[PDB]
Enzyme design. Sequence first.
Site, PDB file in Angstrom:
ATOM      1  N   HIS B  40     -17.588  17.028 -35.576  1.00  0.00           N
ATOM      2  CA  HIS B  40     -17.414  16.258 -36.803  1.00  0.00           C
ATOM      3  C   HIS B  40     -16.795  14.869 -36.570  1.00  0.00           C
ATOM      4  O   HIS B  40     -16.800  14.057 -37.489  1.00  0.00           O
ATOM      5  CB  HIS B  40     -16.614  17.055 -37.854  1.00  0.00           C
ATOM      6  CG  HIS B  40     -15.135  17.063 -37.630  1.00  0.00           C
ATOM      7  ND1 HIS B  40     -14.483  18.114 -37.026  1.00  0.00           N
ATOM      8  CD2 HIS B  40     -14.177  16.166 -37.947  1.00  0.00           C
ATOM      9  CE1 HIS B  40     -13.189  17.862 -36.974  1.00  0.00           C
ATOM     10  NE2 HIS B  40     -12.975  16.682 -37.517  1.00  0.00           N
ATOM     11  N   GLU B  52      -3.151   6.137 -22.814  1.00  0.00           N
ATOM     12  CA  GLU B  52      -2.454   5.658 -23.963  1.00  0.00           C
ATOM     13  C   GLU B  52      -1.320   6.551 -24.343  1.00  0.00           C
ATOM     14  O   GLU B  52      -1.437   7.729 -24.242  1.00  0.00           O
ATOM     15  CB  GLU B  52      -3.450   5.680 -25.128  1.00  0.00           C
ATOM     16  CG  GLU B  52      -3.997   4.329 -25.499  1.00  0.00           C
ATOM     17  CD  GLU B  52      -4.829   4.331 -26.750  1.00  0.00           C
ATOM     18  OE1 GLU B  52      -5.297   5.386 -27.139  1.00  0.00           O
ATOM     19  OE2 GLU B  52      -5.014   3.253 -27.328  1.00  0.00           O
ATOM     20  N   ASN B  54       1.424   4.946 -26.572  1.00  0.00           N
ATOM     21  CA  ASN B  54       1.571   4.174 -27.774  1.00  0.00           C
ATOM     22  C   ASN B  54       0.165   3.635 -28.110  1.00  0.00           C
ATOM     23  O   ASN B  54      -0.318   2.764 -27.459  1.00  0.00           O
ATOM     24  CB  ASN B  54       2.529   3.021 -27.553  1.00  0.00           C
ATOM     25  CG  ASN B  54       2.983   2.395 -28.845  1.00  0.00           C
ATOM     26  OD1 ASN B  54       2.242   2.302 -29.794  1.00  0.00           O
ATOM     27  ND2 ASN B  54       4.186   1.985 -28.886  1.00  0.00           N
ATOM     28  N   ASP B  84     -17.882  23.607 -33.827  1.00  0.00           N
ATOM     29  CA  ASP B  84     -17.306  22.263 -33.947  1.00  0.00           C
ATOM     30  C   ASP B  84     -16.826  21.780 -32.558  1.00  0.00           C
ATOM     31  O   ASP B  84     -15.642  21.865 -32.203  1.00  0.00           O
ATOM     32  CB  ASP B  84     -16.206  22.232 -35.035  1.00  0.00           C
ATOM     33  CG  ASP B  84     -15.831  20.805 -35.480  1.00  0.00           C
ATOM     34  OD1 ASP B  84     -16.475  19.812 -35.051  1.00  0.00           O
ATOM     35  OD2 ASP B  84     -14.870  20.680 -36.262  1.00  0.00           O
ATOM     36  N   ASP B 171       2.403  22.169 -37.749  1.00  0.00           N
ATOM     37  CA  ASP B 171       0.929  22.207 -37.777  1.00  0.00           C
ATOM     38  C   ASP B 171       0.323  20.916 -37.225  1.00  0.00           C
ATOM     39  O   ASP B 171       0.993  19.877 -37.181  1.00  0.00           O
ATOM     40  CB  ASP B 171       0.456  22.380 -39.223  1.00  0.00           C
ATOM     41  CG  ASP B 171      -0.960  22.990 -39.350  1.00  0.00           C
ATOM     42  OD1 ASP B 171      -1.649  23.239 -38.330  1.00  0.00           O
ATOM     43  OD2 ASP B 171      -1.387  23.235 -40.514  1.00  0.00           O
ATOM     44  N   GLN B 174      -4.345  15.601 -40.352  1.00  0.00           N
ATOM     45  CA  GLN B 174      -5.404  14.571 -40.351  1.00  0.00           C
ATOM     46  C   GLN B 174      -5.107  13.471 -39.330  1.00  0.00           C
ATOM     47  O   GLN B 174      -4.026  12.877 -39.336  1.00  0.00           O
ATOM     48  CB  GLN B 174      -5.622  13.961 -41.740  1.00  0.00           C
ATOM     49  CG  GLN B 174      -6.586  14.741 -42.625  1.00  0.00           C
ATOM     50  CD  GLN B 174      -6.022  16.076 -43.088  1.00  0.00           C
ATOM     51  OE1 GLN B 174      -4.856  16.164 -43.468  1.00  0.00           O
ATOM     52  NE2 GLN B 174      -6.852  17.110 -43.085  1.00  0.00           N
ATOM     53  N   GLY B 175      -6.067  13.235 -38.443  1.00  0.00           N
ATOM     54  CA  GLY B 175      -5.912  12.302 -37.341  1.00  0.00           C
ATOM     55  C   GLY B 175      -5.809  12.990 -35.997  1.00  0.00           C
ATOM     56  O   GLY B 175      -5.985  12.327 -34.970  1.00  0.00           O
ATOM     57  N   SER B 177      -7.793  15.734 -35.284  1.00  0.00           N
ATOM     58  CA  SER B 177      -9.120  16.292 -34.959  1.00  0.00           C
ATOM     59  C   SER B 177      -9.632  15.864 -33.598  1.00  0.00           C
ATOM     60  O   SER B 177      -9.463  14.718 -33.192  1.00  0.00           O
ATOM     61  CB  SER B 177     -10.207  15.895 -35.981  1.00  0.00           C
ATOM     62  OG  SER B 177     -10.189  16.738 -37.108  1.00  0.00           O
ATOM     63  N   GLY B 178     -10.275  16.800 -32.916  1.00  0.00           N
ATOM     64  CA  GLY B 178     -10.822  16.561 -31.598  1.00  0.00           C
ATOM     65  C   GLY B 178      -9.843  16.807 -30.472  1.00  0.00           C
ATOM     66  O   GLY B 178     -10.252  16.977 -29.320  1.00  0.00           O
TER      67      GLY B 178
END
Lengths: 223, 223, 163, 163
Positions: B40, B52, B54, B84, B171, B174-175, B177-178
Site C-alpha cells: 500500500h 538516516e 534525523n 501487504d 503502538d 500513521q507514518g 507503514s512499511g
Amino acid sequence: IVGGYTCGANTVPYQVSLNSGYHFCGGSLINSQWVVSAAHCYKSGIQVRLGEDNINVVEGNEQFISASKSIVHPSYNSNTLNNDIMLIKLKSAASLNSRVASISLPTSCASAGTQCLISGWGNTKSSGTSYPDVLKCLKAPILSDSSCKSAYPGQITSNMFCAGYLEGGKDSCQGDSGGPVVCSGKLQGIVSWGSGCAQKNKPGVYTKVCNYVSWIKQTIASN
Amino acid sequence: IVGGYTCGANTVPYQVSLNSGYHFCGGSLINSQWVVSAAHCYKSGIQVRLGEDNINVVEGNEQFISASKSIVHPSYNSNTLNNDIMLIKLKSAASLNSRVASISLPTSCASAGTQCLISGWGNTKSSGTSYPDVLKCLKAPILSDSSCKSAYPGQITSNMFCAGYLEGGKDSCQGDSGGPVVCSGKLQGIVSWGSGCAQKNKPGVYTKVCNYVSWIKQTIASN
Amino acid sequence: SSVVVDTNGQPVSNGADAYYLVPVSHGHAGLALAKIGNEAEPRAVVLDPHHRPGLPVRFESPLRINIIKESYFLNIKFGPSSSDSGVWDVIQQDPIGLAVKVTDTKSLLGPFKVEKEGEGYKIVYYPERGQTGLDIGLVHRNDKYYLAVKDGEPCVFKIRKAT
Amino acid sequence: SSVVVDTNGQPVSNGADAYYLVPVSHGHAGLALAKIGNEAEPRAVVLDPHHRPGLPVRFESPLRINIIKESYFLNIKFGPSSSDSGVWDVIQQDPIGLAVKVTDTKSLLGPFKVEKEGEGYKIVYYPERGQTGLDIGLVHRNDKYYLAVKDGEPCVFKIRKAT
Ligand SMILES: [Cl-]
Ligand code: NA
C-alpha cells in the site's frame, strides 16, 4: 541543455530543482520563500532543492525544502500551452549563501538580440539522450516575435517568446523545463517547449515572464 | 511510534525511508540492493533514504538511492488488506557501514510472547499529531492469533499477525507503514494497519513475513 | 493509485488534518447538518447556502500511512480524528433516497473513496468493498442540497485544507 | 494530471525510452502492422496474436520535461525517437472505420493521451485538442485486432519498458 557548458558552483545560485523521488523540472528562486517554474511541471508534494550543482551527490551546501503552496496560473491552458507558469511557496525560508540567491523580476520586457543565460540538468544531445551530473549553461539570443511565429505558425501567443539559434546545435531540452532564462540580470523566461532539441529552424519557446509580474507580485502579497 | 524511545544512530541500520518529495513510508534493507516494505506504500519514482536518523537534516551518512523496480506482491488485495508486501530493487548497491546494514529473513515463523523491535518516523501521539525528527523505537510482543482475531473480527488472514499491547498506550501509527518488525534478529513483520493507534484492544497489525520468504527469494533471483 | 491532493498541491492526510469540501459548481455553499424526515436532531449531510465555508471533514484509513490515495477505502467524518462521532454513512430514507447521514459508530474500513473527477474530486460510496461505486450527488430540497447517491451526477469538490 | 507509469513502477519518459503496450485481456497478442484496404504495404496498427510482445512505442511531447502525465497531448510512434516515420494517426478507412495507422510526418502536438483505465492504461484520441476524447479499442478482422476508435470499449494496456 544542448551545446552548452558546465556552469560551475556559485554561477547560477537562483537555479533550483523540482523533485518527487527524482528530478523532473528546473525552477528559479525569486525571493527567500518563493520559486517560479512552469505550470506543466505541477506535481503534488514537490520538494524544492537548492544549492545543487551535481544533482547525483550530496554536496552538503544543499537545502531541501518542501512546497507549502503550488499555484498554477489560473488561465493555464494545457491544450494551447499558453500561460505556462507556476509559483511555489516554500514552507520555510531558504538561507542564502554562495550557492543560493534570488533572481529579481524584470521591470520591462527584453528585446531581440539580447543575449540570455539559460540553465538546466536536461538532456545534452539533439539525437539520443545523455543526462548531466552538473548544472549546464547556455547563452542564447532572444528572437523577434515575427520569426518565432514563422518558426511555429499557429502556436505562439503573446505570453511566449523564442530564444536560441535557427542554425540548431544550441538549445534547452527535456529536463530543462521550468528553468531560468535570465537577460540583463533579470528573470525574463521560463523553459517551456520546442519541436525537438537544437534542431534547425526550431528554437526554444519560453514563457514571457514580464507579462506575469503583476500577477506574481499580487499572488505573493495575498498568500 | 506511540510510547516508544529514540533509537539512536547505529541501532536500526536496516531502517530506510521511502520518499517522493516527502517521507511517506518505512522500509527494511534485506540486502545491499533490495528493500522490503508494504504494498500500500506503492508510488511512482520512489527514492529510498538509508543511514538516516534525523529525517529532516542532511547528516552526511545518508545514501539517497532511487528505486529502479517496485514490485508489489501479485496477490495484493486493496479490498481485504491481504498480502501487504512490496520489494524495491535499488538502482545501485547501498554501501554498507555502521549506520547502513541489512536485516536477514526468517527461517521460521515467530511465536506469541516473542518480543519484537518496531521502528519508524510516524506519529508519536494516540490522539492528535506530532511527527518526530529522529527515528523512534518500540519493544512489543507478538500477540496470539486468537487475541488478534478477537480484536478485529473477520479481518485477520493467515498472512497477518498482531503485536503490541491490549491495554493500549504503545503502538505503531500513521507514518510507520512499511517499517520493520524484527524479532530474534530477523525480519518477521511489516507495519500495515490498525484501528486508531495505541487504543484499547486495537493492536498493530503486521504483514507476516515468514509466509513470503520463498516469494522474496524467487523474486530477487529473477529480477 | 494516485495521491489525493488539496488546493495547495499537498497530499491530503490520513486523519491528521481537516479539510473543507468546496464545491466547484455551487461556489456559495458549504457542508452542514440538517433534519430529514420527522427527526428531531439534524442527521443528514447537506450543502447549505447559509453555511460557508462549511463543516470540515477528515479522511480516515486504518493503514499506517499518512497520506490518502484514490484506491483507499475511507471513513469521512466531521469533528476530531479519534472520535466515533460525526461519521458519514449512506442510509435509505424518504424523501431523499440513499442519504448521506452522520452516525456514532466507525468501522475499521469505511465505505467511501475520493476519486478524481473533472477539475476536482468526487465522493464515491461502496455498499460492499469488492463492488462498483455509487457517485455522491445532490438532492435539491428546502433551499439546500442533500448529499445522496446520484450515480452519474457527482458533486465535484475541491479539497481545501482548514489550516 | 497524474504521471504515466511503467510495469516496474517508474515514470514513463518523454521520447528517451521505448515501451511495449501489453494488453491485459489479450495477453498472447502484441502490436504489429497489417494491410487494410487494397494497400500494398502494411500501415494499420494491429494487435497481432502471431507477434509478441510486438513493436515498441515511444511517447513524445514538445514540453521540455522527461516524464509523461495523463494530461499531455502525445505523439505515439514505432521506431526511433527523433524520426518522423512510424508516427500513429487516426484515418477513416473501410473496412475498419476510424483506424489507427502509421505515417511519415509528426505534428508538434500529437492527438493522443494515455489515461488510467481499470488495471492499466488506455490510448485516447482527440480530433481537436479542446474536445472530449475517443477511446482506442479493437476491431476483430482477418484473425487480428485492428486498433480503431471504439468509444466506451478501450483496449487496456500495461506499459512495459523494452529495457
Ligand atoms: Cl503521485
Ligand atoms: Na430523533
